[PDB]
Ligand binder design. Sequence first.
Ligand code: MG
Ligand code: MG
Ligand code: MG
Ligand code: MG
Ligand code: MG
Ligand code: MG
Ligand code: MG
Ligand code: MG
Ligand code: MG
Ligand code: MG
Ligand code: MG
Ligand code: MG
Ligand code: MG
Lengths: 148, 130, 34, 118, 176, 77, 138
Amino acid sequence: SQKIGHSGLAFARLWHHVDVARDKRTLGRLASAIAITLIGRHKPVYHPSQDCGDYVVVTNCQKIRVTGKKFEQKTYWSHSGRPGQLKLQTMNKVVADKGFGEILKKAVSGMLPKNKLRKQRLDRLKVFDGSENPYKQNITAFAHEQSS
Amino acid sequence: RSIIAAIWAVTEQKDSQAVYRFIDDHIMSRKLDITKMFQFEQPTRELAMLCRREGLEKPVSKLVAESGRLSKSPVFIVHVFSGEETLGEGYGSSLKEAKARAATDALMKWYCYEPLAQQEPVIDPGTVVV
Amino acid sequence: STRPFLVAPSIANSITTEAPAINHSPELANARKW
Amino acid sequence: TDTTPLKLSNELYAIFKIHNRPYLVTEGDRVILPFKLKQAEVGDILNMTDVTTLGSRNYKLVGHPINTSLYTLKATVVGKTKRAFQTREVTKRRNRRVRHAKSKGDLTILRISELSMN
Amino acid sequence: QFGFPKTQVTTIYNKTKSASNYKGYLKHRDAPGMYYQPSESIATGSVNSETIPRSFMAASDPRRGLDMPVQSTKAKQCPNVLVGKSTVNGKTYHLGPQEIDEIRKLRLDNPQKYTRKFLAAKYGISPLFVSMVSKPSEQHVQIMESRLQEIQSRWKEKRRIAREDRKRRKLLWYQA
Amino acid sequence: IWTGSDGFWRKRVEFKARTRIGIISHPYIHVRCILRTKSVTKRRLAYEAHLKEQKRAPWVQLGDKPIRGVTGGVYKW
Amino acid sequence: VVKAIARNSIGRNGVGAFVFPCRKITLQFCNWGGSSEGMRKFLTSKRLDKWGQEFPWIQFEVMRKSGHPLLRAEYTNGREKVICVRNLNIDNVENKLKLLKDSDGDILRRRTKNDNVESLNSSVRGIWSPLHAAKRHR
RNA sequence: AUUCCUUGGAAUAUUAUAUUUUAAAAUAUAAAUACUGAAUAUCUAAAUAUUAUUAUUACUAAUAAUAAUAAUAUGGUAAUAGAACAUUUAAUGAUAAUAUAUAUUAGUUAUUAAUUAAUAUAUGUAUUAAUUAAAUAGAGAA
RNA sequence: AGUAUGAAAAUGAUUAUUUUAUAAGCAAUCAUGAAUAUAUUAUAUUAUAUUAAUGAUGUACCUUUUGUAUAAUGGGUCAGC
Ligand SMILES: [Mg+2]
Ligand SMILES: [Mg+2]
Ligand SMILES: [Mg+2]
Ligand SMILES: [Mg+2]
Ligand SMILES: [Mg+2]
Ligand SMILES: [Mg+2]
Ligand SMILES: [Mg+2]
Ligand SMILES: [Mg+2]
Ligand SMILES: [Mg+2]
Ligand SMILES: [Mg+2]
Ligand SMILES: [Mg+2]
Ligand SMILES: [Mg+2]
Ligand SMILES: [Mg+2]
């Protein structure tokens, strides 16, 4: 009974926004949180046989919080098939190369379920080191929130 | 039909409503969603006309919430206000669509109104004509 | 002559910030090149 | 307990529990109980004497067996039929004998005929 | 009004991380009594009595006095969407009969010079209104039709299909 | 248009070096075809295709995708 | 404008009146044939009469055919169960008959975990929406 | 939740909600049983066997068949014990082309089997149902 | 190596339905959308059948072994014996 009705809004992909400048969660935690959103576990209509997750826009990713000495010491790895071609890059190095966004993305990828849907979900997450971005318009926004 | 007729014939005097009861048990017990029967041309106009007929401020569609503009599948929520009383919520992938939906919803509300048995038999002023 | 647009508080109040220099940017690469 | 807004609504749902199994129904639904009833036959009617929750779109009465005085929810038994037959094959990993474990459990089908406030 | 306690559809588990899990909801049990649970849902296709506005109920129905088609949103804040200029600034009936006649004559004479927009500009009035008033020369209409047909023909396969789909969607979106 | 094997292929032995033995087989086939007409059959199939296309439900953005899964006898909303 | 798009009503067997699902039962047997001995005994034994007395809305045909003994039963929906009661005894035959009577004609079918209710009524509460949730997500 | 006394009660605090009062303050209510987690246990039905109680049906009736209630038991290699089915032959043996046999598809009966319906091919038609007797009596394993 | 008959399988070509060109492992089972086919009670918001969206679970079988996914034995498939 309950499942019957117009279900179009449930399975609508919302765009969420997280300002990492105004969020005090440290990297990993934040990533984990994002993962849930991506999967769509937050919504009661979720079923594992279905990608129903929302879009997440992360902005000001340069101000992400990383604890301890991880910025210097935390090493990301990449291997071709060819022996001797192990690349090991420190987080800072990676940031310099690509950006904090990349870091965040990696974490999210790690978090996510390892199946076909993964890649799509990952791509749903849009990250920007600084503030500006092309999705400003499409973040979910209510009419009552317009006091500011 | 004949069976019903026969029933009526036998119970015309001893229990007049018996036939009706039987019919209800059999014919009227069957599910029909009345919501699935409608199909509107341009409902906004109709809604406006209805408002005019009644004692209502002119209906205006307004954006309540919006997400995913600039995307394959956005969501726009528009209500059709009459002053303050919201007359019909309407969701849509486009603004236009949302507006249309709101109007349709309003129309449905107007029509499919189902009053209680404790109320005094309500009689409508027919159908809206435009 | 306005259009029905809304805006999130989270995105309005977000202080402006410039994105730093990515090494894999074309501009940066240009500088590097010989 | 002021039960007026349930009284006034046209759509109404109930969450009755048979042997603690909760089923959430409106009137006209068909509840498939996963067992054979011996008390009721076909055509009999059951008045539900355990209803956890009655609900409208926006209000909901709740309680551990809420008074039978407040509502009338009665279901008629339509069918006693079994769910389809299956032979799940049981065996170990280097042993030629197999134990065919057959399964054709039984169902009782109800129809929620009345669901109203009293 | 009613002074009932209000609640969310609660789960004993974490809602953020496990909202789809039925078991949690089942596990949760609340103190016997009445409750107010606002529907976590739009009322678009619905015909529920607790969905109908007070203005559409008869002046007698007890539900009028009760408070459960809640006016949560406020019309002051919500932007006007896809509205005509006559709604923002009230309708005008300034235009007389002679003027109308003249307009009609003009339309009959030269549609490309005196198009609807032009007419509107001239007489401070809506194109729709102009259309309502006056039919153009049928030849013009025919020409327009022909043009449209040509355009349609010029379409590729995919585009036609897309158009059809769009039409279908449109049709659907008045069902509710 | 298709190929069947025809009847009785004759197997021959083919002696190889050392004591090794192949068995050569001489295959014979038959080609069968069915020719239909562009006037009727093709037209009919085109019509069918068109009908199918017409039937096809449109891609809706907020399409009522059924809430897959069992309910549980409990409202999550 | 309002245009009507046609539809038809769906029958809910038990909501108003209740039509009894089983309508006819045909006890089929054979004079010659040891497999049909139990059936014959059943036919003899006033049990049939008793059954008839109990359940008058359902009619009992009694055919004579050369093969194995049967209980073909005909239901409202149209479908027909048929049980060959080869070599059964009286009591077993009776049990079979009972089973036939109890069932609605509907075809057998695998149920999933917890698929209990089957409605054609739109949800009383709406289908959840992210925008009309009590709690926004973040 | 925290503290005290002896599963409980009390206080304190927190959260949530409702109502009143001027985003606060007061009043009442609820929550404090953490949760997940097995083919474990219970419940919920079904089968079989045994023990002990029944009920119905039929002239070792202290029996049999079926159905209840309570209980206990039901993983399994080597192995022991008990009970069935398929196939073929012999004894007995109605019946019938609206019948049968075999095949395909969809049903039905707790289903290696049989039966129902439709379809196709035979065939003036069962070594047919059933009880016995027997076996060149069942094959992915050499 | 009798004569008829032969929709028995393995095996080949072809056509239809369906799935399939960002996806990785006994190819099944369970969940679960979608598409197609049939149905003289689909009254439908119907029922079955077919089908590698998608998700979860899932080391072939025998033999011999203290013990086998084993990279230990044995088997190309089917029919007959
Ligand atoms: Mg072993
Ligand atoms: Mg095995
Ligand atoms: Mg979890
Ligand atoms: Mg040949
Ligand atoms: Mg050579
Ligand atoms: Mg060769
Ligand atoms: Mg157990
Ligand atoms: Mg055992
Ligand atoms: Mg042998
Ligand atoms: Mg063999
Ligand atoms: Mg075998
Ligand atoms: Mg192992
Ligand atoms: Mg080998």
